[PDB]
């Protein structure tokens, strides 16, 4: 009669590493590293993302012609640009503080678009129609942005305009506008008459004045002229006031912003589907409860910690010695 003391063992082939020895087979273990994904851009908490497709933030907000699809959008869980998001500023120029605008948009979950300055109403004495170019063509004909209005002299009569708006929305209002810089002094005449005009925007915290800088510059999309775009967030109660005498690409539509958190802009060419997730990445959605992941550093939602590791297996059982 005898009795022996021993320990479990099996056919397991999982291996872990230790400081003293590599590739040790153990009886049981757990993986802490998630490396698999959805392959698709999904919904976060029911709401779906906002594709810009061929458009970029600039195009979308400004109202570039090709981005009419986006016109109807009002809420999203995260904004998505792609490898071919080049439809934005159709008429050459500069978008002052563009990056800071994007950063602002990263904490906006939804807004309400509204005609701040009605085309046919807020502009008598000044001529509304006939403010288009080939640079921003449509269907084949010439056109312009759907949110900005190009005011030109009404029969060699460009009086000094002064329009204002009061923020009565209880939210923040995003106001965008532009300033034109014709190539030759001749054109200044034919567009706003007055040889030396000016534009002046102002509110409680904002104050800035612009003056045309006519000159000779290379052609971009068949244009030696330029156009700088601007923006600012009008606070609740405050009043913004434009006052120009030519060159003022005026605000036609504005947005009342809803600040939400945990949203953001991403660049991905992955297909959008009717799928819901708790963690999204540019490569696809993730669904794990593991502590780490090596899929992508860019994240939206609640994800595992990004890490460069290839393998992270933690032993639980003991050294597996079959000795069969």
């Amino acid at each position: 009669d005898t009795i022996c003391i021993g320990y479990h063992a099996n056919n397991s082939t999982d291996t872990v590493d230790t400081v003293l020895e590599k590739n040790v087979t153990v009886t049981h273990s757990v993986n802490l590293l998630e490396d698999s994904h959805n392959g698709k851009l999904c919904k976060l908490k029911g709401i779906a993302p906002l594709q810009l497709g061929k458009c970029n933030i600039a195009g979308w907000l400004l109202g570039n012609p090709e981005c009419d699809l986006l016109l109807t959008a009002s809420s999203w869980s995260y904004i998505v640009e792609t490898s071919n998001s080049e439809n934005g500023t159709c008429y050459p120029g500069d978008f002052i503080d563009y990056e800071e605008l994007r950063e602002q948009l990263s904490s906006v979950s939804s807004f309400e678009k509204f005609e701040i300055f009605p085309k046919t109403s807020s502009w008598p004495n000044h001529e509304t129609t006939k403010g288009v170019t080939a640079a921003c063509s449509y269907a084949g004909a010439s056109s312009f942005y759907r949110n900005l209005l190009w005011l030109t002299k009404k029969g060699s009569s460009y009086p000094k305009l002064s329009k204002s708006y009061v923020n009565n929305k209880g939210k923040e209002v995003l106001v965008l506008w532009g300033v034109h810089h014709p190539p030759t002094g001749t054109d200044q005449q034919s567009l706003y008459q007055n040889a030396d005009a000016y534009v002046s925007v102002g509110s409680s915290k904002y104050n800035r004045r612009f003056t045309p800088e006519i000159a000779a510059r290379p052609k971009v999309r068949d244009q030696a002229g330029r156009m700088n775009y601007y923006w600012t967030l009008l606070e609740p109660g405050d009043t913004i006031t434009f006052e120009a005498t030519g060159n003022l690409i005026a605000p036609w539509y504005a947005f009342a912003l809803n600040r939400g958190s945990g949203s953001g802009i991403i660049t991905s060419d992955a297909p959008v589907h009717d799928c819901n997730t708790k963690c999204q990445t540019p490569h696809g959605a993730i669904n794990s409860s593991l502590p780490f992941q090596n899929i992508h550093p860019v994240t939206i939602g609640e994800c595992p910690k990004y890490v460069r590791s290839t393998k992270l297996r933690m032993a639980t059982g003991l050294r597996n010695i079959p000795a069969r």
Binding site: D1, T2, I3, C4, I5, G6, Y7, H8, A9, N10, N11, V16, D17, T18, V19, L20, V24, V26, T27, V30, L32, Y98, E99, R102, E103, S106, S261, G262, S263, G264, I265, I266, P291, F292, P297, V298, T299, I300, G301, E302, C303, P304, K305, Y306, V307, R308, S309, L312, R313, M314, A315, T316, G317, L318, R319, N320, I321, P322, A323, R324
Partner: protein, 160 residues
């Protein structure tokens, strides 16, 4: 083995026993068999489980984290941001990989210690009534039955 038991004075494991990690064999007239010790196996389990949960706790989950953009005259700032992102990434990777490496060593030794402790818990019970052979097996002098084997894999026994 830091404790000389597993893959040590007890050369190998029993692919047979499947009730836990540590147990007894036993060869009494009435027949042979295997039986895992709940006492031991359950404690090891509770510990290891607690360890894995503790490791996952210290690693808070990551929330939204998107990139930033910079114009062609914000290069220094762009790289500072780049330096920060890469720096944190190196550290977390280092921490994660190291913790696992170090804790794995600790786990394997834990088991080795557990096995060794069971052996000497039995050995101190028998004493004279049996003799130490090899591979951690004891050979009874007073040849005992199944009713007795259950006093061994229990701690009752009694017989200096």
């Amino acid at each position: 083995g830091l404790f000389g038991a597993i893959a040590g004075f007890i050369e190998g494991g029993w692919t047979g026993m499947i009730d836990g990690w540590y147990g007894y064999h036993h060869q009494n007239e009435q027949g042979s068999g295997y039986a895992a010790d709940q006492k031991s196996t359950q404690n090891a389990i509770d510990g290891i489980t607690n360890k894995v949960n503790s490791v996952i706790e210290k690693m808070n989950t990551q929330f939204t984290a998107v990139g930033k953009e910079f114009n062609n005259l914000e290069r220094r700032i762009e790289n500072l941001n780049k330096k920060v992102d890469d720096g944190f990434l190196d550290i977390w990777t280092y921490n994660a990989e190291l913790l696992v490496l170090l804790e794995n060593e600790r786990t394997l030794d834990f088991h080795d210690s557990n096995v060794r402790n069971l052996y000497e818990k039995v050995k101190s019970q028998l004493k004279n009534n049996a003799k130490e052979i090899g591979n951690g097996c004891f050979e009874f002098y007073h040849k005992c039955d199944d009713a007795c084997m259950e006093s061994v894999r229990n701690g009752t026994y009694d017989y200096p």
